[PDB]
């Protein structure tokens, strides 16, 4: 095999360090002859090379038999080496995505076999790699080799070898502009505009160039034919998709299946629209065992059969016109999930997915819908290289009352309202300026750090007062008692002054869903009500209601 | 001749990641590299340098060129002690004091001195490619690089060569380097401010070197305000003692018990009430109090500023500088087709380079944003040639109104 005439990338143990010095453990006849014979033939083949006594340094080698065959296999234990050989930089920082794919006539796959054989290694770092194949038991002295390639295993190898391919392919990518070369690992992917004619042509002139160069890639006959089955997608050559998504029926369900087919509903997630996978999830919380058992809830189940009905019949997603302009649309599945779609041209997707995130814990449709926005965004960046123009579900006033007076910046690039239920809005506003007439409640909480024990009430004006107690307790929850209680209490119109800031800071955020049911239960209130304002004093400042509410929930806790 | 860097004991070059770019910042990118190489600043470089910094591309201020910009953030971390404590730019007291201050470009003397060779790793940044299509192009410099504190830190002594005679003849003007800047501050007409600029311009020229006005000694206060009013309410008061209350404990004697009493028992917040004037000493002694500066409150070299930042609306925003928090050394507002973001980034520049000339050190900022929002975004809107420093926060409810 050719062994590539490129320039060798120097190569360095980490500061401080020294090659490995590990002993080769004694091994069967068998072995040792296994091994014999490999390494007498990649010697042959310039892989690797004889040496002396003199370098001290040793790495163990194995020989694995065969399943089913009667073939043996060298393996290398490169793991010291490796945890000495200096970092190198990462060899891809993402995966291509196919919806990314710009259309191109013809593209044909080429491998190039025996890859990392066929590159040299840094001539002063060859010693580092010796290995020795231990003679019959103790006595004789072993074989002593070290490699000339890059071997299998070892640290620097995926990142050498495509820096080599990078700058063997450079010249022809010059002279050849008009053709896409994909590099991924030691595959290329040649695309072009041509008719078979300078293609199958154009392919073997680049064959030949890599040839040159001491690589070798298969050739017609035995180049891949399309679809493409590539990292779990389809390539046609109009179309993609993912591969074959088979949901298994079963009586019992264990951790272990769920687990598996939650992945891959969420790899279906990218081309079929609407899969929902949440139920399914909560099942897998605080979960037991791999093999145990979990009996589907009504929800899972609901969740699973719309699933299948949605996998019932192929989807498939087109690939990338980078003179027409992306369209991203949004919409609410429900229980904090979102689905988009990203096209170009009305319903011919590129590409699905979904947001579930909890970004924090309460919140709104309104900051869910925003953060779906982003992460869309982020990930058109990536795969396009620009941002998508959006179809929201929420009216542009709702946005604008919502962004103008929330305290954090926000900015959803350009986008247009499409009205598609369910509709995202804002359950509830307070009131800006007290409302005349109506009671107003100071309400108190305070929690016994020691026993755990809290009370929560009110004061009103209108001579209104109360006082509930509570068990397992903090501050914080006494807090938010005291302000559900004169929600209950109080009718259409309340002033209710509070010194939580805590509380405060919740609800004025408008926030519509929670973790704390109790959270929940001041949001069902806060609906209910006609005008609700919401004001906050500091504690412990004998202020008038403040020492009064204080005093009540004081008593008995501290 | 290159002047050796070592990175702090310990310390490791920058492995930071390169956040994703769109085709036209890339492209950009890829024509000002290519010609950056072919004039030798920078040389490809191989998979055996594990570093990485961040580039981005921006368009600069009132400007259609497209200018890259690395982020040295990390690696400036790492390298503290050449830059500051070995190699230190000592900051000008005066600068502050002066009429008019212009900020000129001075980073492209940086690309006439060579970078220590053993340095250069450390200064690798890549050029990412869409849908992954291909490797990233990666580089390294070999050149002083913009951004870098550790250039003028080394230039250093060529600038003073450059400036002696400007600075021989005219005394009265303070020139201070920061990054790649220079701050010329003047206390003469404006007419020959400009005039006197224009001056040093040409001296720069002579050097290969190739602006913008501040009034630094017009920088005033945002005093905590109370209102003045007619008729209060129980709302109001509570308000007012509530602001009152805060204001105190970070400003040194104030006081309230004037006016809590007139909040007695529990009435209705949309009730007035008629006001005791020795309330009205204390309105009046706050108030009296509040318009002056902290007392006790000095800015320590040693430790790092800090700057926060709240929205008010209406393109209006607040903020504060301290070391300590209440601990106030400045605060200060910003006033604006603006979106948040582009506000924001416009204020985080302005308290940046105020910040530069009254302490020679840019603040850590607390951005009332979404990190990913802050990221994506922020570069559309950037002009400056460095970045500070920042993190993310929720602004607290009370901090907010207290500010207005
Ligand atoms: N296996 C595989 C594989 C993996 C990747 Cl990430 C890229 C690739 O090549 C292309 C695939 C392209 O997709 C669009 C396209 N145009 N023509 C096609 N013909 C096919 N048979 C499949 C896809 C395409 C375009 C250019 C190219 Cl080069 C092949």
């Not at chain 2, 702090?8 to 956040?19: L, N, T, Y």
């Not at chain 2, 008019?100 to 790793?121: C, H, I, N, Q, W």
């Not at chain 2, 390294?140 to 550790?150: A, E």
């Not at chain 2, 105020?354 to 850590?364: A, D, F, L, M």
Request: glycine residues 6%; hydrophobic residues 35%.
């Amino acid at each position: 095999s050719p062994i590539s005439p490129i320039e060798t990338v120097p190569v360095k143990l980490k500061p401080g360090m020294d090659g490995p010095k590990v002993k080769q453990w004694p091994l069967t006849e068998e072995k040792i002859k296994a091994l014999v014979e490999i390494c007498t033939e990649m010697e042959k083949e310039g892989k690797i090379s004889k040496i002396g006594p003199e370098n001290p340094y040793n790495t163990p080698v194995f020989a694995i038999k065969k399943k089913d065959s009667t073939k043996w296999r060298k393996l290398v234990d490169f793991r010291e080496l490796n945890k000495r050989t200096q970092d190198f930089w990462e060899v891809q920082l993402g995966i291509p995505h196919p919806a990314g794919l710009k259309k191109k006539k013809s593209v044909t796959v080429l491998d190039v076999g025996d890859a990392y054989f066929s590159v040299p290694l840094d001539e002063d770092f060859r010693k580092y790699t010796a290995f020795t194949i231990p003679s019959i038991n103790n006595e004789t002295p072993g074989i002593r080799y070290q490699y000339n390639v890059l071997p299998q295993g070892w640290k620097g190898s995926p990142a050498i070898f495509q820096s080599s391919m990078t700058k063997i392919l450079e010249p022809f990518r010059k002279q050849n502009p008009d053709i896409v070369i994909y590099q991924y690992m030691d595959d290329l992917y040649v695309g072009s505009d041509l008719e078979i004619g300078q293609h199958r042509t154009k392919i073997e002139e680049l064959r030949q160039h890599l040839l040159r160069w001491g690589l070798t890639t298969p050739d017609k006959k035995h180049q891949k034919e399309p679809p493409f089955l590539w990292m779990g997608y389809e390539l046609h050559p109009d179309k993609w998709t993912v591969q074959p998504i088979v949901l298994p029926e079963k009586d019992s369900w264990t951790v272990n299946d769920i687990q598996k087919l939650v992945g891959k509903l969420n790899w279906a997630s990218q081309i079929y629209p609407g899969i929902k996978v949440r139920q399914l999830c909560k099942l897998l919380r605080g979960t037991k065992a791999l093999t145990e058992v979990i009996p589907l809830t009504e929800e899972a189940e609901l969740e699973l059969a719309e699933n299948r009905e949605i996998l019932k019949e192929p989807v498939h997603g087109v690939y990338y016109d980078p003179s027409k302009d992306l369209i991203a649309e949004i919409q609410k599945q429900g229980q904090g999930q979102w689905t988009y779609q990203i096209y170009q041209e009305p319903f011919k997707n590129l590409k699905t997915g979904k947001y579930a995130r909890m970004r924090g814990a309460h919140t709104n449709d309104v900051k869910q819908l925003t953060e779906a926005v982003q992460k869309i965004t982020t990930e058109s960046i990536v795969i396009w290289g620009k941002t998508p123009k959006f179809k929201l579900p929420i009216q542009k006033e709702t946005w604008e009352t919502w962004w103008t007076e929330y305290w954090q910046a926000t900015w959803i690039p350009e986008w247009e309202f499409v009205n598609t239920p369910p509709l995202v809005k804002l359950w509830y506003q307070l009131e800006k300026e007290p409302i005349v007439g109506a009671e107003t409640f100071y309400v108190d909480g305070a929690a016994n750090r020691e026993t755990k024990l809290g009370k929560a009430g009110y004061v009103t004006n209108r001579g209104r007062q109360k006082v509930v107690t509570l068990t397992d307790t903090t501050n914080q929850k006494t807090e938010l008692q005291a302000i559900y209680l004169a929600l209950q209490d109080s009718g259409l119109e309340v002033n209710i002054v509070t010194d939580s800031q805590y509380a405060l800071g919740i609800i004025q955020a408008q926030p519509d869903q929670s973790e704390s049911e109790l959270v929940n239960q001041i949001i069902e209130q806060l609906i209910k009500k006609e005008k609700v304002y919401l004001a906050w004093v500091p504690a412990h400042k004998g202020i008038g209601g403040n020492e009064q509410v204080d005093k009540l929930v004081s008593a008995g806790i501290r | 001749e290159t002047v050796p860097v070592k990175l702090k004991p310990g310390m490791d070059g920058p492995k930071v990641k390169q956040w994703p770019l769109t085709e036209e910042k890339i492209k950009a990118l890829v024509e000002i590299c290519t010609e950056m190489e072919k004039e030798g600043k920078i040389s490809k470089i191989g998979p055996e340098n594990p570093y990485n910094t961040p580039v981005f591309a921006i368009k600069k201020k009132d400007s259609t060129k497209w200018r890259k910009l690395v982020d040295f953030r990390e690696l400036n971390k790492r390298t503290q002690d050449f830059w500051e404590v070995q190699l230190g730019i000592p900051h000008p007291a005066g600068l502050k004091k002066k009429k008019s201050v212009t900020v000129l470009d001075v980073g492209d003397a940086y690309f006439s001195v060579p970078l220590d060779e053993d340095f250069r790793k450390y200064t690798a940044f890549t050029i990412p490619s869409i849908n992954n299509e291909t490797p990233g192009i990666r580089y390294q410099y070999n050149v002083l690089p913009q951004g870098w504190k550790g250039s003028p830190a080394i230039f250093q002594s060529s600038m003073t060569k450059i400036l002696e005679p400007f600075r021989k003849q005219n005394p009265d003007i303070v020139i201070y380097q920061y990054m790649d800047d220079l701050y010329v501050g003047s206390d003469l007409e404006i007419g020959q401010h400009r005039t006197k600029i224009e001056e040093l311009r040409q001296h720069l020229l002579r050097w290969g070197l190739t602006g913008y006005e501040l009034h630094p000694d017009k920088w005033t206060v945002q005093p905590i305000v109370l209102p003045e009013k007619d008729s209060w309410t129980v709302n109001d008061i509570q308000k007012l003692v509530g602001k009152l209350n805060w204001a105190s404990q970070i400003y040194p004697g104030i006081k309230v018990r004037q006016l809590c009493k007139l909040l007695r028992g529990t009435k209705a917040l949309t009730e007035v009430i008629p006001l005791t004037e020795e309330a009205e000493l204390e309105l009046a002694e706050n108030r009296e109090i509040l318009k002056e500066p902290v007392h006790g409150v000095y800015y320590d070299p040693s430790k790092d500023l800090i700057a926060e930042i709240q929205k008010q609306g209406q393109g209006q925003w607040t903020y504060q500088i301290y070391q300590e928090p209440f601990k106030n050394l400045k605060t200060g507002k910003y006033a604006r087709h603006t979106n948040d973001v582009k506000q924001l980034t416009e204020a985080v520049q302005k308290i940046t380079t105020e910040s530069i000339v009254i302490w020679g050190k840019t603040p850590k900022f607390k951005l009332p944003i979404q990190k990913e929002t802050w990221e994506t975004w922020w570069t559309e809107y950037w002009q400056a040639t460095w970045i500070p420093e920042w993190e993310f926060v929720n602004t607290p409810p009370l901090v907010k109104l207290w500010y207005q």
